[PDB]
């Protein structure tokens, strides 16, 4: 049971991480001290509020 | 319900009490003790569980663990 | 050699308790616990009894170790291991649950 | 002590402002109940 | 003798009470454990251990010095640069819990 | 009327050090007396410590404007 | 039911009064938090073919600073409101200089009615609210933060401060229950204030679009 | 290195020790106390290292 | 979370639980037998209940007593509902609450043989005697941790967490639950993301998602900085609607064709 659980986790978590990374790959903190994305859309006026 | 006989009223009350009791949920088990001070309420009542020892607050309900 | 006696006594007590629970369930005395059916509450009581017995055996084993013991040193240091590992190695493994 | 007294009287002024708002709202309610009546 | 110091200390306590009310209305359930940049307790301990405070003798530190120092440090730590009223409001809002 | 932070971020510091090291490796004049070393990266680090790197950073803003900051103008982190 | 219907009507009236007070319209402190006893003593407490009948408990309230701007709160009796009812309501509203209003429908209105509602939008603003949605005031919920409708002057000031185009601000559709509660329309920013655990307070903005 | 100051607790630290006496002098050598970057009390474990 | 006095005592909370739990005829009915009794007064079965009250067929739907008492119902409301639900087309002759058997008598007045079968089936499957849909059954468990206990600032100052009754359903309605009396409309969350967006609003959805994520990530004792959670929540609630992290939510954004093909749907987006 434990081995099967580990095998399925090793197969599912990778896809989960991939989807999480491909959705916030362009977000960054610009020099205006604010977090935006590639479309220059402000997501947070300050990183982590 | 009010017009029912004494025996019928008692039976209905017993059934209602049994249903009310059965509707409840079993309390989480654990070893209750006052040796751990909960940081969320300042009280000493709480329950622990060894597995790492998880600490569950009794009154405040502070949840923590000690390794 | 005394911890073995305590562990055997605890295991026998747990076996007697679970047998008594089974007898009560057979003769229709164990009333259903709130929020669960008869089989569910029976299984929950059995599991709680077994877990209490395992914890008692593990605690008895832990309190019967010596400062020179290596398992205890590695567990308290936290480098590699845990108390449950010592409990399974010496006192008793426990329940082999699935799903 | 005098500063405490002037703070107290300022609170009294705010209470009087509440009174004037209440009286104004009533004085418009007397007119608005007529519309509420004629609506039905 | 000086009453200005007394008034300043009273104002400081009033501000402290206001901050306590803000914390209570912002952090329900009384969770003292919070994450902040600078561990002030560790810094105070290091200062004590370096300058050899020896917390038994009467120290030479007037309360007004502490009040003015805190006010100036509350000004130096800026996040939203700009004297604009909106800028100042945002700066106060952001650097609120730390202050 | 510059509003960017007056501190040098790690990214900018690393890029400036690398660029100065590359320039020095390409037979460029140094801006500090050499105490007997040859690694261009070490020379770049020494210049950064001495605040004599002839480079100015252009921090672009989201709107489109930019600000020219000089290495000898803002404070260095490390 | 009789008592339950009266309780629902009282709760709806309280929610409407709270909504009007939130928008800015001046309202009594008494009716803002009036209990149900005076509600019974006022209307009659016999909604089942009695005095407290719909379209009679309507309230007209004027704005705080603009006494010339009002808004009606109708209560059509038809479970499936049609177009004739809203048509006659609009016709009767045309006598006064009023423009805004609020319709309280029993059940979801027919799709044919929404077309007429949006048709008269530039001349007479009117929206709808199902009674099921008025039995609770969402703005008081723990998850819902404290919203503040901003004015154009401060919106422009904000846009100019950060040098950011309004199109870059977050988006919030008009279908949002909060949006309809405050009556905000397209092209209008709303301030948000959430308790920040890492910064005490954090204020963000969202443009309706 | 340096003058570090920190306080940590050992794995086998009895909870009913701080409340009672022997708080600053632990019979079991627990309650790690470091002053001026010098170990004074306690036994090092994962909780501190 | 109960609001009224019911939060303290379980007697006044069981009725709240029952009214929030879906109850149908199947849950209260024990046996259902159809009989082609020609004359109503004939009463092929031995029951002295029709003569006092006064089509050649009827349904004898006898109800259970234990379940009915557990849900605390009365035959008056059952008869009223069964008569109003199907119009003024039948005539349910209920029974007094004094006899031992909880028998009923459903008759139709104005192909006809299967009509009774169809009507009994469609009423037994779903009737909603007392409760709302979706919600199947409701639990009743006391809070053992601070995450659900009530907190009120005492006059002395200390918080003094209080232990109050709380319910745990198995469905998603929210809207029809908050409107019910003796229910705190301020602390009763929903544990669902898409549901809150149609009740409270986008910001409430963001907060709920943040709380759910923190709960599921901190269950194993691990810790993750809140900044990352907040950044994820804002990115999923930036365009107003709940953009899905899958290929169907990120490719809809106006990012750019070269960025959509990287994740998934290469040739489609190109």
């Amino acid at each position: 049971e434990g081995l099967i659980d580990t095998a399925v986790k090793t197969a599912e978590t990778g896809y989960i991480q991939r989807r999480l990374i491909k959705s916030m790959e362009s977000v960054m903190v610009k020099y205006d001290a604010t977090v935006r994305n590639s479309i220059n859309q402000v997501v947070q006026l300050r990183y982590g509020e | 319900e009010e017009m029912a006989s004494d025996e019928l009223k008692e039976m209905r009350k017993n059934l209602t009490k049994e249903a009310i009791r059965e509707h409840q949920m079993a309390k989480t088990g654990g070893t209750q003790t006052d040796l751990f001070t909960c940081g969320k309420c300042k009280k000493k009542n709480c329950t622990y569980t060894q597995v790492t020892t998880f600490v569950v607050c009794n009154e405040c309900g502070n949840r923590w663990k000690f390794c | 050699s005394k911890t073995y006696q305590d562990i055997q006594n605890t295991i026998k007590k747990a076996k007697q308790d679970v047998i008594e629970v089974i007898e009560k369930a057979h003769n229709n005395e164990l009333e259903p616990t709130p929020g669960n059916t008869l089989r569910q509450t029976f299984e929950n009581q059995v599991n709680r009894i077994l877990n209490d017995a395992r914890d008692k055996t593990g605690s008895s084993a832990q309190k019967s170790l010596s400062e020179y013991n290596n398992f205890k040193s590695m567990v308290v240091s936290g480098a590699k291991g845990s108390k449950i590992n010592i409990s399974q190695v010496i006192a008793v493994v426990g329940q082999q649950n699935v799903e | 002590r005098q500063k405490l007294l002037k703070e107290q009287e300022e609170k009294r002024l705010r209470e009087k402002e509440e009174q004037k708002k209440l009286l104004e709202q009533r004085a418009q309610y007397v007119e608005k109940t007529k519309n509420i009546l004629m609506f039905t | 003798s000086n009453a200005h110091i007394q008034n300043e200390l009273e104002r400081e306590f009033e501000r402290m009470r206001e901050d306590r009310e803000v914390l209570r209305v912002i952090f329900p359930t009384g969770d003292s454990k919070v994450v902040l940049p600078c561990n002030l307790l560790r810094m105070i301990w290091n200062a004590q251990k370096i300058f050899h405070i020896n917390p038994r003798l009467p120290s030479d530190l007037h309360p007004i010095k502490v009040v003015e120092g805190v006010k100036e440090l509350s000004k130096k730590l800026v996040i939203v640069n700009g004297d604009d009223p909106l800028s100042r409001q945002a700066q106060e809002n952001a650097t609120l819990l730390f202050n | 009327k510059r509003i960017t932070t007056p501190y040098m971020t790690k990214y900018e510091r690393a890029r400036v050090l690398g660029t100065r090291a590359l320039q020095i490796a390409m037979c460029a004049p140094v801006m500090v007396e050499l105490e007997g070393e040859t690694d261009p990266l070490l020379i770049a680090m020494k210049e950064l410590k001495a605040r004599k790197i002839p480079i100015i950073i252009r921090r672009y803003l989201p709107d489109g404007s930019y600000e020219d900051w000089g290495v000898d103008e803002l404070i260095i982190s490390d | 039911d009789d008592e339950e219907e009266t309780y629902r009507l009282w709760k709806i009236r309280k929610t409407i009064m709270q909504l009007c007070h939130d928008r800015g319209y001046l309202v009594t402190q008494d009716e803002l938090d009036q209990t149900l006893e005076e509600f019974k003593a006022q209307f009659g407490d016999k909604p089942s073919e009695g005095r407290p009948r719909r379209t009679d408990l309507t309230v007209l309230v004027a704005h705080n600073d603009d006494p010339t701007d009002q808004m009606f709160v109708f209560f059509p009796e038809e479970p499936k409101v049609g177009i004739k009812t809203i048509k006659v309501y609009c016709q009767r509203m045309q006598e006064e200089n009023i423009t805004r209003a609020l319709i309280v429908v029993q059940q979801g209105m027919t799709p044919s009615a929404k077309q007429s509602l949006v048709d008269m939008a530039p001349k007479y603003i009117l929206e709808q609210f199902l009674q099921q949605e008025l039995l609770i005031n969402i703005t008081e919920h723990e998850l819902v933060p404290e919203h503040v409708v901003m004015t154009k002057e401060e919106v422009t000031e904000l846009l100019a401060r950060y040098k950011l185009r309004e199109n870059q601000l977050p988006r919030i559709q008009a279908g949002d229950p909060v949006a309809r509660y405050f009556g905000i329309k397209r092209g209008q920013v709303v301030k948000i204030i959430r308790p920040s655990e890492t910064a005490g307070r954090y204020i963000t903005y969202r443009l309706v679009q | 290195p340096g003058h570090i100051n920190c306080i940590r607790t050992h794995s086998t630290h009895p909870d009913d020790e701080d409340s009672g006496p022997y708080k600053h002098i632990s019979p079991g050598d627990t309650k790690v106390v470091v002053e001026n970057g010098e170990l004074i009390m306690g036994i090092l474990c994962k909780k501190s290292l | 979370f109960l609001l009224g006095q019911s939060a303290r005592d379980a007697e006044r909370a069981k009725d709240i639980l029952c009214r929030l739990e879906h109850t149908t005829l199947r849950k209260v009915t024990a046996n259902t037998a159809i009989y082609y009794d020609p004359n109503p007064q004939s009463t092929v079965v031995a029951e002295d209940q029709e003569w006092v009250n006064v089509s050649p067929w009827l349904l004898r739907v006898e109800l259970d007593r234990k379940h009915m008492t557990d849900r605390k119902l009365t035959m008056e409301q059952i008869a009223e509902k069964i008569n109003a639900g199907f119009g003024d087309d039948l005539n349910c002759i209920f029974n007094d609450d004094n006899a031992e058997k909880l028998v009923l008598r459903i008759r139709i007045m104005n192909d006809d043989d299967v009509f009774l079968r169809c009507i009994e089936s469609n009423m037994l499957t779903d009737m909603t005697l007392q409760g709302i849909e979706q919600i199947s059954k409701v639990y009743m468990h006391l809070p053992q941790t601070d995450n659900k206990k009530k907190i009120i600032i005492t006059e002395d100052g200390e918080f003094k967490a209080l232990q109050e009754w709380i319910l745990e359903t198995d469905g998603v309605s929210l809207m029809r639950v908050l409107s019910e009396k003796d229910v705190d409309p301020v602390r009763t969350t929903s544990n669902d993301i898409v549901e809150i967006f149609t009740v409270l609003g986008i910001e409430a959805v963001r907060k709920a998602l943040e709380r759910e994520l923190y709960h599921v990530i901190s269950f194993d004792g691990s810790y993750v900085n809140y900044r990352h959670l907040a950044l994820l929540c804002d990115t999923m609630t930036c365009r107003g609607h709940l953009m899905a992290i899958t290929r169907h939510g990120v490719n809809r954004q106006d990012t750019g064709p070269l960025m959509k093909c990287s994740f998934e749907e290469t040739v489609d987006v190109l």
Side-chain angles (χ1 to χ4, degrees), chain A, chain B residues 4 19 26 29-30 39 61, chain C, chain D residues 1-25 27-35 37-40, chain E, chain F, chain G, chain H, chain I:
Chain A
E1 182 192 22
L3 292 169
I4 296 165
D5 297 2
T6 302
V8 298
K9 181 173 64 174
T10 51
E12 189 67 6
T13 190
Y15 194 3
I16 294 295
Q17 183 173 4
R18 170 173 174 78
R19 293 209 305 277
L20 291 172
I21 292 170
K22 295 300 302 184
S23 62
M24 302 183 298
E25 60 181 359
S26 59
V27 180
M28 59 184 298
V29 186
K30 305 295 186 178
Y31 287 92
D32 195 5
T34 177
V35 184
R36 308 194 182 188
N37 59 331
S38 60
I39 322 182
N40 297 16
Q41 296 177 357
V42 64
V43 182
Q44 300 183 355
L45 302 179
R46 305 292 160 174
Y47 170 65
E49 305 177 355
Chain C
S1 65
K2 177 180 178 294
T3 308
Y4 292 152
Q5 301 301 144
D6 293 67
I7 293 161
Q8 294 296 351
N9 299 329
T10 302
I11 293 168
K12 182 172 64 178
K13 292 290 183 300
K15 287 181 180 298
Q16 182 55 222
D17 297 1
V18 296
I19 291 167
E20 293 173 356
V21 178
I22 294 167
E23 292 291 357
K24 293 171 63 177
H26 287 183
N27 296 335
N28 308 90
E29 289 74 7
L30 193 158
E31 298 295 351
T33 304
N36 295 325
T37 64
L38 186 64
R39 297 181 179 275
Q40 294 175 354
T41 183
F42 169 83
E43 296 290 354
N44 296 15
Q45 292 184 9
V46 177
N47 293 121
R48 289 191 307 93
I49 293 171
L50 294 179
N51 300 331
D52 298 3
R54 178 173 58 86
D55 298 1
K56 184 178 293 185
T57 55
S59 58
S60 56
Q62 290 291 0
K63 297 179 180 179
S64 60
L65 303 176
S66 60
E67 64 283 7
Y68 295 95
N69 174 16
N70 293 332
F71 292 86
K72 183 175 179 59
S73 62
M74 290 184 295
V75 170
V76 304
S77 66
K80 180 64 65 174
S82 53
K83 297 181 182 299
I84 186 174
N85 300 326
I86 293 175
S87 180
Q88 293 184 8
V89 171
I90 300 175
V92 63
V93 181
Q95 179 61 225
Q96 302 305 142
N97 298 279
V98 297
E99 298 183 355
Chain D
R1 189 266 187 183
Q2 312 330 315
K3 302 299 144 299
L4 168 144
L5 265 295
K6 57 92 180 181
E7 276 294 351
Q8 177 52 268
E9 63 79 20
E10 181 265 336
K11 303 318 296 156
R12 296 268 65 83
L13 305 186
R14 266 59 193 173
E15 191 277 323
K16 185 63 64 177
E17 297 164 27
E18 183 277 348
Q19 297 174 245
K20 83 169 186 62
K21 282 196 304 308
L22 176 143
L23 82 84
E24 188 281 345
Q25 185 55 262
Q28 62 181 92
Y29 268 181
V30 67
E31 198 285 341
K32 287 170 159 60
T33 181
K34 303 316 302 168
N35 189 5
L37 174 58
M38 56 165 273
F39 180 80
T40 181
Chain E
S1 61
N2 185 322
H4 181 57
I5 304 303
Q6 298 185 8
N7 299 278
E8 186 65 12
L9 269 46
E10 183 62 15
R11 185 181 296 93
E12 176 182 347
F13 182 80
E14 183 63 12
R15 187 184 299 96
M16 199 72 64
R17 184 201 303 274
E18 184 63 12
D19 295 336
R20 169 172 169 272
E21 293 293 351
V22 176
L23 292 176
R24 276 189 169 185
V25 303
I26 294 292
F27 293 87
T29 65
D31 180 6
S32 172
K33 189 172 176 179
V34 64
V35 191
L36 297 173
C38 299
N39 188 15
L40 303 176
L41 301 177
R42 188 200 311 163
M43 301 297 179
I44 294 170
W45 191 2
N46 299 332
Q48 289 179 113
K49 285 288 176 292
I50 294 169
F51 298 92
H52 302 171
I53 293 296
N54 183 331
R56 178 167 305 273
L57 298 177
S59 62
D60 55 328
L61 178 61
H62 204 271
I64 192 66
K65 299 291 185 179
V66 174
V67 178
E68 63 182 0
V70 175
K71 287 182 178 180
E72 294 177 2
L73 181 56
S74 302
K75 303 294 181 61
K76 287 187 182 59
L77 310 182
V78 290
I79 301 299
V80 181
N81 186 19
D83 300 335
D84 177 301
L86 180 57
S87 176
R88 293 184 297 92
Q89 178 55 217
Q91 166 54 18
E92 189 274 353
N93 296 324
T95 308
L96 179 60
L97 180 60
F98 182 88
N99 291 334
Chain F
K1 300 185 295 302
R2 301 182 298 182
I3 59 176
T4 58
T5 182
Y7 295 92
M8 182 183 298
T9 55
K10 60 179 180 298
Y11 305 98
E12 301 171 348
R13 178 175 58 86
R15 188 171 180 181
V16 175
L17 285 173
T19 297
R20 182 61 180 180
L22 183 62
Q23 293 178 2
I24 294 169
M26 290 189 184
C27 184
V30 299
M31 300 300 179
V32 66
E33 191 279 347
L34 282 62
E35 300 292 358
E37 65 287 6
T38 60
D39 180 359
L41 205 170
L42 298 180
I43 301 176
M45 193 68 177
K46 184 181 293 186
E47 286 188 353
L48 180 62
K49 291 292 181 180
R51 304 176 63 86
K52 296 293 183 62
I53 297 174
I55 302 177
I56 59 184
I57 307 175
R58 179 174 290 184
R59 300 173 179 183
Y60 293 88
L61 285 66
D63 58 7
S65 180
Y66 58 91
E67 301 179 358
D68 298 2
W69 289 85
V71 171
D72 60 356
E73 298 182 8
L74 58 144
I75 302 176
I76 60 180
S77 62
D78 187 7
Chain G
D1 191 324
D2 182 80
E3 184 64 12
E4 280 60 1
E5 183 174 3
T6 304
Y7 179 85
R8 294 165 58 182
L9 291 175
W10 172 74
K11 190 66 177 63
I12 290 169
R13 186 179 180 83
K14 177 179 290 299
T15 304
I16 292 293
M17 301 263 63
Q18 290 179 352
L19 191 164
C20 293
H21 179 59
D22 295 359
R23 287 189 175 181
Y25 298 85
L26 181 60
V27 182
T28 36
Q29 181 57 216
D30 177 70
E31 297 176 358
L32 182 60
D33 61 1
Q34 66 177 350
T35 62
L36 189 139
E37 182 65 8
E38 60 277 17
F39 184 88
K40 292 200 183 309
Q42 182 176 359
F43 298 96
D45 189 70
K46 184 66 175 179
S48 59
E49 302 180 359
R51 290 288 293 96
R53 63 183 302 276
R54 307 179 68 88
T55 65
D56 305 9
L57 81 183
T58 180
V59 298
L60 184 66
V61 67
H63 197 274
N64 179 271
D65 58 3
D66 181 2
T68 59
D69 184 3
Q70 302 74 3
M71 56 182 297
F72 269 109
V73 185
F74 302 142
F75 298 87
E77 289 70 345
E78 286 64 2
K80 192 70 173 181
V81 65
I83 298 177
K84 298 296 184 298
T85 60
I86 55 176
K87 185 176 180 60
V88 59
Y89 278 118
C90 181
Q91 289 292 350
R92 273 62 182 89
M93 289 174 59
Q94 187 175 357
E95 283 65 0
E96 293 67 3
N97 62 335
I98 63 179
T99 57
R100 299 181 66 86
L102 194 167
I103 311 303
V104 185
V105 300
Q106 292 289 356
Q107 300 296 353
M109 59 175 60
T110 181
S112 60
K114 300 179 181 178
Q115 302 296 350
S116 52
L117 265 66
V118 301
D119 192 331
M120 307 301 179
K123 57 174 68 176
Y124 291 96
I125 290 76
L126 73 178
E127 50 189 5
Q128 53 77 21
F129 285 86
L130 286 61
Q131 61 178 354
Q132 182 60 298
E133 298 180 357
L134 296 177
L135 295 176
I136 59 182
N137 188 336
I138 62 180
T139 59
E140 282 62 358
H141 191 262
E142 179 62 13
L143 298 175
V144 178
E146 192 274 351
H147 296 54
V148 183
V149 175
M150 293 190 302
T151 59
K152 183 178 292 184
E153 188 282 341
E154 57 185 343
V155 172
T156 56
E157 180 59 20
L158 168 62
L159 296 170
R161 196 279 184 179
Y162 294 88
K163 306 180 183 300
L164 171 139
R165 191 69 60 85
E166 76 299 347
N167 181 87
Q168 302 179 1
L169 295 176
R171 305 293 181 85
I172 178 176
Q173 59 181 14
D176 186 320
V178 181
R180 294 188 302 94
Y181 180 89
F182 283 85
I184 60 184
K185 64 180 183 300
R186 179 180 300 273
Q188 186 174 1
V189 183
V190 185
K191 186 182 293 184
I192 305 297
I193 308 180
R194 303 189 305 274
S196 169
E197 61 181 358
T198 55
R201 183 181 300 95
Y202 175 79
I203 304 179
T204 182
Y205 305 91
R206 298 205 174 187
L207 182 144
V208 181
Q209 182 178 4
Chain H
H3 300 0
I4 299 172
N5 301 324
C6 67
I7 301 174
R8 298 294 301 183
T9 178
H10 185 53
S11 177
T12 57
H13 180 53
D15 53 357
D16 64 326
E17 184 172 15
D18 57 358
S19 302
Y22 304 154
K23 180 179 183 178
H24 297 276
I25 178 175
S26 184
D29 188 357
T30 62
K31 183 62 181 297
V32 181
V33 184
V34 182
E35 301 184 357
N36 296 324
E38 300 183 3
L39 184 59
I40 308 302
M41 294 175 56
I43 303 174
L44 306 179
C45 63
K46 61 177 289 299
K47 303 298 182 181
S48 56
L49 301 179
Chain I
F1 296 89
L2 302 176
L3 180 61
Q5 191 274 356
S6 304
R8 277 74 65 85
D9 62 345
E11 192 284 338
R12 298 188 65 179
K14 187 66 176 65
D15 54 358
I16 305 299
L17 189 163
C18 287
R19 191 169 69 268
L20 295 173
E21 188 277 350
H22 189 185
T23 303
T24 64
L25 290 168
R26 186 177 63 269
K27 305 302 299 302
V28 300
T29 303
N31 300 322
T32 297
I34 187 177
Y35 300 84
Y36 276 73
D37 180 69
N39 191 331
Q41 66 86 9
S42 64
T43 63
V44 303
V45 302
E47 299 300 347
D48 302 356
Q49 303 179 9
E50 196 282 340
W51 298 280
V52 67
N53 184 90
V54 179
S55 180
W57 46 66
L58 54 75
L59 296 69
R60 176 179 174 182
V61 187
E62 64 86 3
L63 302 179
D64 190 335
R65 175 167 293 180
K66 60 185 293 183
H67 299 344
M68 186 171 176
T69 56
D70 294 327
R71 287 74 174 183
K72 189 175 67 172
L73 275 58
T74 179
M75 295 187 181
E76 301 294 353
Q77 59 185 142
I78 297 172
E80 288 179 359
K81 295 181 67 58
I82 200 70
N83 179 85
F86 297 88
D88 192 335
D89 301 330
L90 298 78
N91 179 15
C92 179
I93 303 300
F94 62 89
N95 181 25
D96 301 329
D97 301 330
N98 301 332
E100 195 284 337
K101 295 293 183 300
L102 289 67
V103 301
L104 303 173
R105 291 182 175 273
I106 288 69
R107 182 186 304 274
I108 184 175
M109 60 303 297
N110 59 332
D111 58 2
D112 301 332
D113 302 351
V114 299
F115 185 88
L116 301 186
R117 185 73 63 82
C118 181
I119 201 179
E120 86 83 5
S121 301
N122 65 30
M123 73 177 62
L124 187 65
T125 52
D126 55 329
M127 184 60 187
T128 306
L129 302 179
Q130 179 178 355
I132 56 178
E133 289 65 1
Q134 293 76 34
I135 304 304
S136 60
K137 64 188 299 185
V138 185
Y139 308 148
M140 184 175 178
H141 186 260
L142 295 171
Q144 301 305 139
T145 57
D146 58 354
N147 64 334
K148 301 182 182 300
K149 293 182 177 181
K150 183 177 180 60
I151 303 299
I152 182 59
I153 285 68
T154 60
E155 75 300 354
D156 61 72
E158 297 296 352
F159 285 93
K160 188 178 177 300
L162 302 176
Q163 186 176 5
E164 306 294 354
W165 291 98
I166 56 178
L167 305 181
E168 182 67 6
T169 64
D170 292 352
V172 174
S173 186
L174 186 60
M175 174 57 64
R176 304 176 56 85
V177 178
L178 300 179
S179 61
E180 295 296 344
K181 60 177 65 176
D182 303 330
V183 175
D184 190 329
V186 179
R187 295 175 60 184
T188 295
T189 181
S190 178
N191 189 23
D192 185 335
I193 306 303
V194 64
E195 183 67 6
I196 301 178
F197 181 85
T198 56
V199 177
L200 294 186
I202 183 55
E203 211 67 9
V205 180
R206 179 186 175 278
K207 185 62 177 182
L209 201 170
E210 171 185 330
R211 290 199 308 181
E212 293 293 346
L213 182 59
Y214 179 86
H215 179 58
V216 303
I217 194 63
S218 63
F219 177 83
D220 58 1
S222 63
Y223 174 84
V224 183
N225 194 341
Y226 157 77
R227 297 184 170 81
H228 305 302
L229 311 175
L231 181 64
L232 176 57
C233 287
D234 292 330
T235 52
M236 298 174 59
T237 59
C238 182
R239 300 295 83 181
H241 59 74
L242 284 297
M243 63 185 296
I245 299 299
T246 61
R247 55 173 166 276
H248 298 272
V250 300
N251 297 324
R252 305 297 77 86
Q253 185 176 8
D254 59 333
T255 58
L258 286 302
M259 183 178 181
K260 303 175 187 179
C261 63
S262 303
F263 185 18
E264 295 183 351
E265 298 183 357
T266 297
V267 63
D268 182 72
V269 301
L270 297 172

